[PDB]
Write an enzyme that holds these catalytic residues in place. Structure first.
Site, short mmCIF file in Angstrom:
data_model
loop_
_atom_site.label_atom_id
_atom_site.label_comp_id
_atom_site.label_asym_id
_atom_site.label_seq_id
_atom_site.Cartn_x
_atom_site.Cartn_y
_atom_site.Cartn_z
N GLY A 1 0.88 -1.49 0.16
CA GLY A 1 0.13 -0.27 -0.25
C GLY A 1 0.78 1.77 -0.03
O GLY A 1 0.22 2.62 0.05
N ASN B 1 5.64 -4.10 -8.22
CA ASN B 1 6.46 -5.21 -6.92
C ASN B 1 6.61 -6.62 -7.04
O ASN B 1 7.16 -7.03 -6.61
CB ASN B 1 4.99 -5.10 -6.26
CG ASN B 1 5.19 -3.27 -5.19
OD1 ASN B 1 5.21 -2.26 -6.23
ND2 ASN B 1 4.00 -3.66 -4.28
N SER C 1 22.30 -0.62 -1.24
CA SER C 1 23.56 -0.11 -2.06
C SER C 1 22.45 0.14 -3.13
O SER C 1 22.49 -0.50 -4.50
CB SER C 1 24.71 -1.03 -2.38
OG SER C 1 23.97 -2.41 -2.19
N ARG D 1 10.21 5.07 -9.37
CA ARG D 1 9.35 5.21 -8.43
C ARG D 1 8.59 6.92 -8.06
O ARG D 1 7.60 7.05 -7.77
CB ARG D 1 8.91 4.79 -6.67
CG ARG D 1 8.24 4.22 -6.73
CD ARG D 1 8.22 3.85 -5.65
NE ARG D 1 6.62 3.24 -4.40
CZ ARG D 1 6.64 1.96 -3.41
NH1 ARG D 1 7.47 1.62 -3.38
NH2 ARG D 1 5.46 2.42 -3.15
N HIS E 1 11.09 -5.09 3.85
CA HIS E 1 9.92 -5.34 3.65
C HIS E 1 9.50 -5.08 2.30
O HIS E 1 8.50 -5.36 1.91
CB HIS E 1 8.35 -3.75 3.96
CG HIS E 1 7.22 -4.46 3.97
ND1 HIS E 1 6.67 -5.07 4.40
CD2 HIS E 1 6.64 -3.35 3.35
CE1 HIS E 1 5.65 -4.84 5.24
NE2 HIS E 1 5.14 -3.63 4.42
N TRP E 2 10.25 -5.93 1.22
CA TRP E 2 10.45 -6.45 0.06
C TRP E 2 11.24 -7.75 -0.75
O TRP E 2 11.71 -7.82 -1.54
CB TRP E 2 10.33 -4.84 -0.96
CG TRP E 2 10.10 -5.04 -2.44
CD1 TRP E 2 8.67 -5.83 -2.41
CD2 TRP E 2 10.43 -3.40 -3.35
NE1 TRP E 2 8.75 -5.52 -3.72
CE2 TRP E 2 9.67 -4.44 -4.28
CE3 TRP E 2 11.34 -3.34 -3.67
CZ2 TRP E 2 9.91 -4.31 -5.79
CZ3 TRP E 2 11.57 -2.49 -4.88
CH2 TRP E 2 10.94 -2.88 -5.86
#
EC number: 3.7.1.8
Lengths: 283, 285, 283, 285
Positions: C39, C48, C177, C187, C262-263
């Site tokens: 989100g 994503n 990095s 983005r 978080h990815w």
């Protein structure tokens, strides 16, 4: 103060209660503090808080060691709903027949579940909330369940014996040296005294397994000042539930005793008493 | 005499391993059992700034209170350390006790001060009474919190690039209720940073010589026999709550108290509660 | 495969959706696997999962990178209900207009919340459940909230800027990095491309704060095989929620990547792909 | 040749620190990269008993598999140890590798075997490939579980008072689904206990000389550079789940996988899943 000197009875009338006789021990004057016992075989008001009754009354409090329905000298009963909720209804009834608008609650294990339910159902009838290893809070994030102590608890209810009682106590306490012949034989006689409670408890378990006890979803509703205590070495209820309560109850604090089992108010009576009395007086 | 920062301000020269006629500033008041309070490690930290909400109540409870400025902080002498700070600071506490003829002292330690207190309990077991830890630092990795934590990142940012705004940001992260930050708290701390700029530079040089990882005394916690009281803010964004459990399980005789709606400074954000709990511990434990 | 080559649209019709246009990227044949994005500002299907689309299609799967309502090329929208639930309705609609009875779900953050809601509402329309740092699971037992990443997320939505975007990314990823000028500017343009989404997201937040997202109480309902993944160093969603899901979802497993933010599907694409593909094929 | 316990049974004499012509029994099959699987520490444990659901799939995947019996267990020689078992066992693994001309080996370790694998990775970093840990023991206190845990209490009870019934109780506690215990599993393990009674007595004498606490190598985890795969049963009543996190945070390159509805033996209770995950790790990590 003694068991008999404080021994008293009273009939109550609530949702699922009609002229139900509740036993309890009373002493002292002032604000009312109702202490609720755990759910183990032979459990009871006095037997669980006989080391806290004295100090609290001296602190200027009216102490009531209540026997939940289906326990000790209170009338037998079979529950179709989670005991936490039913027990809370019994509490309201005892305070109604006795004319008590506000009461501070102190609850261990099943008593803690009871206290939580009472705060959720009747928020206008509760003062401060004190929880000691409360049960019925769902799964643990680290402890496999059923926990060691729970397995022994049910084992004792289904197959009562001196041997199993001792095994439960060894897991109940941190310091094994506290398990004396007096304590063993003491609670042993209590269990055999009223077998009907044992069978009724098991039947109730059938009607409402521990899963119906989990009131986690409603913790955000409680607004009463809460004090949570836990034995670092509790093999009956998971330590991480202490954090669960700390994060979900708006105004709470957590105290963890080291070298302590599932009977904090007894194993560390002195520190417990000082902390809770201080909490009731200044919090 | 009235109890104020100035009226309690004193200095003493210490001698110990790594110290020769080194000047230590401290704030003292009261008589009775000695309680030495040790401050945290952020830029501008000092004894008075950390404990001004605690000194009065402790003195009134019958204790001789000493708010010590550790080496390289506030009004104490400057220093570049090449050994872990907790140990060096502990040697300084002993030096101060020796210089003032104090045989045993209860210790209260926040963050770097908590690490200091732990090192003291380990190195000089016969010189300590009870041990009070408030969010101690340097206890290694957290089992849940990614590191460096928010508070640590801001602490190092402030050390390298001191500014009033970054100071405010750090204080905000250290609190649960950010609205509690006062102009006076910020100004006092900013002055400590501005008026002793060398402490910030020396801290960074020291950190390169002895990384925070060298502060980890976890392996020796089982040696501590002092009765211990561990306190933590449930909402501490500087040092991890699970370290409170680490201490609770590894130190022989300890208890843990966690305050809700509380940032890193339990002694400041929840001063009244902290004072009552710790004083009761010192008196009856 | 490319963004445009797989770029497609489709109108849906559900509870709160009427002739709503949903964008997505499709490729490959076989079982359908719908991947749901997070989100954050500028989020989207392809952006994503562009590192997972290839391997999965090769594995013999029909991959659909869906754009949730109010994100990327899908129509703008303001929600009065927790996005998790609304997003799930949008998913059903996309599979209905497209005629898809069963679908495997892969969801990160908001996508994970969406996946959880879908499994709860339409259990007969879901195959296997894959969660990557899903959001909306209530309080953490250890992490103070709002978490670092969440604060930067809202900061970016309310005050869009290149600087704040970078700060969010630095907290989003473990390995700093990996933050290149291409990724940043990439983005950055996406966010500025459709500002209406940013404002609409904030308005929706007003109508339904994260607290309405917590579906913890219904986890015991999910019966779909679930695979939970988490970045050990996730500063957006708490690692302990991984345990929460592991204990409350009947059939689940947990995999935690070290040196991972978080990815996960991007930071550890290779391991993530092998694990999930193996999970879909053999679990 | 068919792959059975007997067809794979072999012995080798080892020489290392604390070992001189000491006989080690092991079960081996396959060719390719070497994978040495190390068993747990309960009474009657052995390589085959621990890994008979894993050897076949690993061999079929192209690995040379060695299920080693550690000193003082099953068919290997008896011994009373005065040093922590993980280290002594690690020296034995090196001794076996030296004797068989094996330069490097991937290690899979359960419980005591996990401690052994960790010690091996620390002492002989150039002799190990990848490291697979399945509920490793001796990592100190848990941050949540009271200790000794249920499984540990039953393990020591069985060592001191061996009986078929106590063995069954221990196995039940080690599982999530207790109905999975078979008559054949119990009988095989009971025979290992009955036919080598000296191992139980020697284990207890050894435990008095070097308590489980001496097995804790937590302080050195940061030294391990081997790619590591940590596995744990969500319902492990023997070693604490949070130790999986401890390893995940302290070892440089590790990943953690937790199986639901799984007791201590992830390799046995969830064999197929364990095999697929570990083989994929060895092949592509």
């Amino acid at each position: 103060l003694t068991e008999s000197s404080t021994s008293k009875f009273v009939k109550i009338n609530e949702k699922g209660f009609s002229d139900f006789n509740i036993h309890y021990n009373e002493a002292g004057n002032g604000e009312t503090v109702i202490m609720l016992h755990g759910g183990g075989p032979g459990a009871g008001g006095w037997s669980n808080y006989y080391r806290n009754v004295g100090p609290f009354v001296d602190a200027g409090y009216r102490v009531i060691l209540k026997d939940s329905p289906g326990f000790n000298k209170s009338d037998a009963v079979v529950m179709d709903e989670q005991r936490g909720l039913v027990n809370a209804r019994a509490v309201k009834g005892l305070m109604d027949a006795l004319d008590i608008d506000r009461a501070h609650l102190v609850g261990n294990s099943m008593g803690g579940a009871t206290a939580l339910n009472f705060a959720l159902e009747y928020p206008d009838r509760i003062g401060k909330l004190i929880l000691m290893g409360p049960g019925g809070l769902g799964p643990s994030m680290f402890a496999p369940m059923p926990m060691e102590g729970i397995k022994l608890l049910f084992k004792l209810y289904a197959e009562p014996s001196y041997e199993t009682l001792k095994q439960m106590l060894q897991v109940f306490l941190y310091d094994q040296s506290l398990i004396t012949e007096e304590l063993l034989q003491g609670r042993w006689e209590a269990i055999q005294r009223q077998p009907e409670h044992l069978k009724n408890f098991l039947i109730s378990a059938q009607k409402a397994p521990l899963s119906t006890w989990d009131v986690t979803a409603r913790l955000g509703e409680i607004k009463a000042k809460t004090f949570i205590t836990w034995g670092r070495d509790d093999r009956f209820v998971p330590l991480d539930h202490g954090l669960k309560l700390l994060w979900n109850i708006d105004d709470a604090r957590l105290h963890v005793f080291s070298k302590c089992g599932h009977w904090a108010q007894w194993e560390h009576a002195d520190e417990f008493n000082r902390l809770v009395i201080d909490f009731l007086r200044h919090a």
